[PDB]
DNA sequence: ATCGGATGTATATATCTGACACGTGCCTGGAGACTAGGGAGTAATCCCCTTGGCGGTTAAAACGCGGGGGACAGCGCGTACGTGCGTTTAAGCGGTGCTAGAGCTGTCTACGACCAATTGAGCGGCCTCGGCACCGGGATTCTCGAT
DNA sequence: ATCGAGAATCCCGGTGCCGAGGCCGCTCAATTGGTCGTAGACAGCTCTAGCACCGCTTAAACGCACGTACGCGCTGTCCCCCGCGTTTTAACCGCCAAGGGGATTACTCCCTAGTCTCCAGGCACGTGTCAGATATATACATCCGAT
């Protein structure tokens, strides 16, 4: 409901940076990464809910997420389509 | 015969800035803009119709396409500008 | 027999051609069928966007002490408005130039 | 009384998390965040499990690419640490 | 009737010519669809699938696995420059990332 | 029957390229999405090609031009060769 | 047959382009790099333009072919056509 | 004799070329380069002047945007002079 | 450089287990036969836009020359981020239950495709004078070398 | 922190020129009245999967102490790019001339949409089984602290 942005823990962001090849991380990376992730998630979810509402459904299917990601150019393979 | 939106863009201009002209290059740019947004919205509406297994494009298809494409309040006014017109079209 | 002809654009209070948009939608290979209100909605949206750009273009032309609109005014209007810049962020305008912008570090101390 | 010099285990977990394909983000906090974000657009919204999984995969792919660009920008500035200015420059150049 | 032979077998392909023809006709792409267009498209799709699968099988052999997993597909795509360019804006679920560390971060002494 | 995919054809091609190698369900779904995406890309480019030239039919020439436009050079040459071989073989019989 | 026309993109032209881009100081190696990237972009556009021209069975490259190529590569030039 | 300092004339040029909307690239050398490049795709190929002008506009816009990204990358590295490494970093982050 | 302790990988082997691949029924979509009509290949023609050349102006490019300011290397500092350890939190994981609603089926009616006259909206040709480019001048503001 | 010479640029007024705007003739595509097929709107039923809840286990997050190495500031060198003057040079513009091929129309012919009948390739459904994930024991590649 509230304050779920802190659920993206600092070790999770550190693991994401390690996957990205980052060796040393400053302390301000976590808040900036949370902000960027929130912006990206809002951008995708807004269009996912738009696709859901147009179809006159109450559940957000994976197909709606795939369509939204394709509409932002982030094509995803593995979840249908 | 070459068709464009030049007369329509000029008519829209006269009701916004009644004493402002426009050059040929700017009119061509406006025609390019109108054609680009037309094909963008029509393609999005066609995709939406295909996704829902529908064989027709209705006003809510265009409305959803406008919501998907135009950002922020630029969509929020435009939807209203669309919907009012349809209502005026409905009540002849 | 037939009543006096009344165009669809004026029936919807628009300036853009509803019939032309309907014809383009029918022949544009978008769907098997086209609804009655879809061209009206699309023409209204296109006219609104045209007016929204033309207002700022005329404002920019007035700011340059000009009575006509040139591509420079369209470019300035689009790059100054945030939503218009977002909508046309991957669009190149001929003879439009660039927005004046100098980084603060390059300015003399 | 045994220690590893700084950066040795930091050099580790790069090979470890580039050899693997697991998500590295906890499922339930991300699902809660997704539901919180979605509840602003529409009230009483349900989600398929595959939808949340697709959102998670896309978000982590985007974050990993952004962190690669951030690391490149940090190296460009003759640094090893990544700073929020690096993220800002990467997002600016990417057009976001 | 002189017996039914699939157009895929007639063209020496494995991908379905009839299914591709049906999808092209029902996809609202054009008013009419030529006879050789589904054959050409099926051939191109089969060639691309063969390339992907061959490189993925090579990756699986390099990983001592007899079954192709998404990691092998991602490795095959990212290790081929033209396959990577074709699918640059594509995310592979459960695919991971290509293992690469910048030389600056490596220890120097 | 209520569902259609390319798993049969992708598996048939897999046995041709690697006779002793299998594929997982997730990888098969990724391959199906890849085939669908390439189908949409080529079909849309061919539709735009037919629109630009005031034609009403999509032919092998439009598909060939779409393949040349989309795929990179070394891959597009082989794709064009395979498509031409398929069309000639289909026309012969 | 034309040759050595990449050198016709002179150093003052690159300097003017950098000035329009907001650049105060320019290194001596910028000109060759800029010529290389301009050549790469030009072949990328012209290959698609010539493909569009050849598909139409034309021997003249019209502005519409260039516009279609640019829109295909994500440039979307306004004005011409 | 009167001589300006090394920084001011560059700023005047920046302002001058940011107010204007002209090309700043000579038309005939650019056209010759376009024909030379197109000669490698089809021989005896004729060009439309509108097509050459469109190519010039697009290439100039691309170069100007790349130069803004290059300036950003130069400033990020605590520099004023743009270097080829800045162009390379900009093209890497952009995707080219 | 070099050696030994101490980790953290690699390697070999047993042991489940649950996806993978293969058989099977069946049904719906692909293939064969046949017909009609319009899209397009093929001929022919016009004229317009492209290509090629030439002469004169001059704006732009090339080149050399100070020289000062920025790039870069080196050095010192100090603090912020790693590494490891102990403790706490909550995420998986395994059930169980309940019901919202996604998906599928059967009518049937309103909506869109289609067609046959009809005409006014919009496109093409053609003047035509006013916005804007240019010049010529003066006045104002910014920059740098001197106190 | 000021002052003045000098260059860059803004503002006012006069002259001209060509292109945006208005007007008229003329096609042809939008309107209107009408009919018919069918797409989906709606009512209804089902079954499934999404949400809520609870208990247990332990994987992981968090807090903290310590150290060290790396970001950052300062300083000195020097070299290389910028401002400016002088000398080519070829870009540009005006003008002419030939013709190649891009638009057009006419014709016809053959390729594809459409419909009927048939039948077999592909999709649920089920089931054996072994590829591989996991656990346990063993061997070595590397890291680091002295030496």
CATH number, domain at G74?
1.10.20.10
Q: Do A51 and B51 touch (CB under 8 A)?
A: yes
Residue H79: closest C-alpha in chain D:
D77
Dihedral angle at the C-alpha atoms of D47, D50, D56, D57, nearest 10 degrees?
-160
CA neighbor of E17 nearest in space, from E55, E43, E47, E49: E43
For residue A75, which residues of chain F lie inside 8 Å, CB to CB? 37
Mutant choice from E3, E22, E37 vs F, greatest count of F C-beta within 10 A = E37
Residue H36 lies in a domain: yes
Any chain A CB within 8 A of the CB of F30? Answer: yes
Any chain B CB within 8 A of the CB of A73? Answer: no
Residue B43: closest C-alpha in chain A:
A71
* Full residue range of the structural domain in which residue G28 is found: 1-80
Q: Do G78 and B25 touch (CB under 8 A)?
A: no
* Angstrom distance, G4 CA to I65 C1': 30
State the nucleotide closest to D48 in CA–C1' terms: J50
Taking a C-beta distance cutoff of 8 angstroms, is the pair D63, A50 a contact? no
Q: Which of residues 33-62 of A touch strand J (CB under 7 A)?
A: 59
How many residues does this entry show for chain F?
A: 93
* Full residue range of the structural domain in which residue B35 is found: 1-92
- Alpha-carbon gap, residue H69 to H64, rounded angstroms: 9
Report in angstroms the alpha-carbon separations of G74 from C91, D86, G67, G77, H58.
Answer: 8, 26, 10, 9, 11
What number of other Cβ atoms are within 10 A of residue F26's Cβ? 19
Residues 6+ apart with CB under 8 A from E22: none
CA neighbor of A51 nearest in space, from A37, A38, A61: A61
Phi, psi (deg, nearest 5) at residue E32: -125, 155
Experimental method: cryo-EM
* Angstrom distance, C35 CA to I111 C1': 8
CB contact residues (below 8 A), chain H span 33-92, against chain G: 33-42, 44-48, 50-51, 53-55, 57-68, 70-71, 74, 80-84, 87-88, 91
Domain count, chain A: 1
Number of H-type helices and E-type strands within chain F: 4, 2
For residue F62, which residues of chain G lie inside 8 Å, CB to CB? 55
Give the resolution value in Å: 3.0
Phi, psi (deg, nearest 5) at residue D18: -95, -20
Any chain C CB within 8 A of the CB of B30? Answer: yes
> Which among E13, E51, E60 has the least Cβ separation from residue F86?
E13
Dihedral angle at the C-alpha atoms of D60, D61, D67, D69, nearest 10 degrees?
-160
> Residue G77 forms beta bridges with which residues?
C92
How many residues does this entry show for chain C?
A: 109
Q: Do F39 and E67 touch (CB under 8 A)?
A: no
Q: Which of residues 24-63 of A touch strand I (CB under 7 A)?
A: 24-28, 56-59, 61
* Angstrom distance, A55 CA to J41 C1': 14
Q: How many CB pairs under 8 A join C and H?
A: 36
CA neighbor of C30 nearest in space, from C22, C20, C19: C22
Alpha helices for B1-92 (secondary structure H): 6-14, 24-51, 59-69, 73-90
Phi, psi (deg, nearest 5) at residue C15: -105, -25
Domain count, chain F: 1
Largest CA-CA distance found in chain D, in angstroms, rounded: 56
For residue H89, which residues of chain D lie inside 8 Å, CB to CB? 72-73, 76
Q: With touching defined as 3+ CB pairs under 8 A, do chains D and A touch?
A: yes
Q: CA end-to-end span of chain A, whole Å? A: 31
For residue B28, which residues of chain G lie inside 8 Å, CB to CB? 79-80
Residue H1 lies in a domain: no
Taking a C-beta distance cutoff of 8 angstroms, is the pair D90, D77 a contact? no
Q: Which of residues 74-93 of D touch strand I (CB under 7 A)?
A: 81
Q: Which of residues 15-74 of G touch strand I (CB under 7 A)?
A: 25, 60
Taking a C-beta distance cutoff of 8 angstroms, is the pair C20, C12 a contact? no
- Alpha-carbon gap, residue C54 to C74, rounded angstroms: 8
* Angstrom distance, E10 CA to I34 C1': 22
Q: Do H76 and D72 touch (CB under 8 A)?
A: no
Q: Which of residues 9-28 of F touch strand I (CB under 7 A)?
A: 11, 22-26
- Alpha-carbon gap, residue F32 to F29, rounded angstroms: 5
Residues 6+ apart with CB under 8 A from C5: none
Any chain A CB within 8 A of the CB of B57? Answer: no
How many residues does this entry show for chain G?
A: 81
Tell how strand G25-26 and strand H81-82 pair up: parallel
**DSSP code of residue A7:** G
CB contact residues (below 8 A), chain G span 59-78, against chain H: 59-63, 65-67, 70, 75, 77
Residues 6+ apart with CB under 8 A from C85: C78, C79
Q: Which two tokens stand for residue C47?
A: 């006219």
CA neighbor of B41 nearest in space, from B64, B14, B11, B18: B64
CA neighbor of A40 nearest in space, from D30, B64, D44: D30
Helix (H, G, I), strand (E, B) or coil at D28: helix
Within a 13 Å sphere around the CA of G2, how many CA atoms are in the beta-carbon half?
20
Residues 6+ apart with CB under 8 A from C45: B37, B41, B62, B66, B78, B81, B82
Within a 13 Å sphere around the CA of A23, how many CA atoms are in the beta-carbon half?
18
- Alpha-carbon gap, residue A39 to G50, rounded angstroms: 41
* Full residue range of the structural domain in which residue D96 is found: 8-96
Taking a C-beta distance cutoff of 8 angstroms, is the pair D44, A22 a contact? no
Residues 6+ apart with CB under 8 A from D3: none
Residue F52's CATH number: 1.10.20.10
- Alpha-carbon gap, residue G34 to G55, rounded angstroms: 32
Taking a C-beta distance cutoff of 8 angstroms, is the pair C24, C46 a contact? no
CA neighbor of H65 nearest in space, from G75, D88, B26: G75
Residue D1 lies in a domain: no
Secondary structure (H, E, C), E58-109: HHHHHCCCCEECHHHHHHHHHHCHHHHHHCCCEEECCCCCCCCCCCCCCCCC
Residue D3 lies in a domain: no
Taking a C-beta distance cutoff of 8 angstroms, is the pair C28, C22 a contact? no
Taking a C-beta distance cutoff of 8 angstroms, is the pair D77, D86 a contact? yes
- Taken in order E86, E88, E94, E95, is the CA torsion positive or negative? positive
Is there contact between E61 and strand I, defined as CB under 7 Å from any strand atom? no
């Amino acid at each position: 409901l509230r304050d779920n942005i802190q659920g993206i823990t600092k070790p999770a962001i550190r693991r994401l940076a390690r996957r990205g090849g980052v060796k040393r991380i400053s302390g301000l990376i976590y808040e900036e990464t949370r902000g960027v992730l929130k912006v990206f998630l809002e951008n995708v979810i807004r269009d996912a809910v738009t696709y859901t509402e147009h179809a006159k459904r109450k559940t957000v299917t994976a197909m709606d997420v795939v369509y939204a990601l394709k509409r932002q150019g982030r094509t995803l393979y593995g979840f249908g389509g | 015969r070459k068709e464009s939106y030049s007369v329509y863009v000029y008519k829209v201009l006269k009701q916004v800035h009644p004493d402002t002209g426009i050059s040929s290059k700017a009119m061509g740019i406006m025609n390019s803009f109108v054609n680009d947004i037309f094909e963008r919205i029509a393609g999005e509406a066609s995709r939406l119709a295909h996704y829902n297994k529908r064989s027709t494009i209705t006003s809510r298809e265009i409305q959803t396409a406008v919501r998907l494409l135009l950002p922020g309040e630029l969509a929020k006014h435009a939807v209203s500008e669309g919907t009012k017109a349809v209502t005026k079209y409905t009540s002849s | 027999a037939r009543a006096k002809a009344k165009t669809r654009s004026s029936r919807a209070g628009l300036q853009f051609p509803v019939g032309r948009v309907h014809r383009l939608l029918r022949k544009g290979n978008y769907a098997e069928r086209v609804g009655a209100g879809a061209p009206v909605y699309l023409a209204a949206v296109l006219e609104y966007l045209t007016a929204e750009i033309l207002e700022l273009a005329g404002n920019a032309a007035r700011d340059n002490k000009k009575t006509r609109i040139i591509p420079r005014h369209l470019q300035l209007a689009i790059r100054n408005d945030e939503e218009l810049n977002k909508l046309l962020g991957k669009v190149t305008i001929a003879q439009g130039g660039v927005l004046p912008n100098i980084q603060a570090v390059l300015l003399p101390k | 009384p045994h220690r590893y010099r700084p950066g040795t285990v930091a050099l580790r977990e790069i090979r470890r998390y580039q050899k693997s394909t697991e998500l590295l983000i906890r499922k339930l906090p991300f699902q809660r965040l997704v539901r919180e974000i979605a509840q602003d657009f529409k009230t009483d919204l349900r989600f398929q499990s595959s939808a949340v999984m697709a959102l998670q995969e896309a978000s982590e792919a985007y974050l990993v690419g952004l962190f690669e660009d951030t690391n490149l920008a940090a190296i460009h500035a003759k640094r090893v640490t990544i700073m929020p200015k690096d993220i800002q420059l990467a997002r600016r150049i990417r057009g976001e």
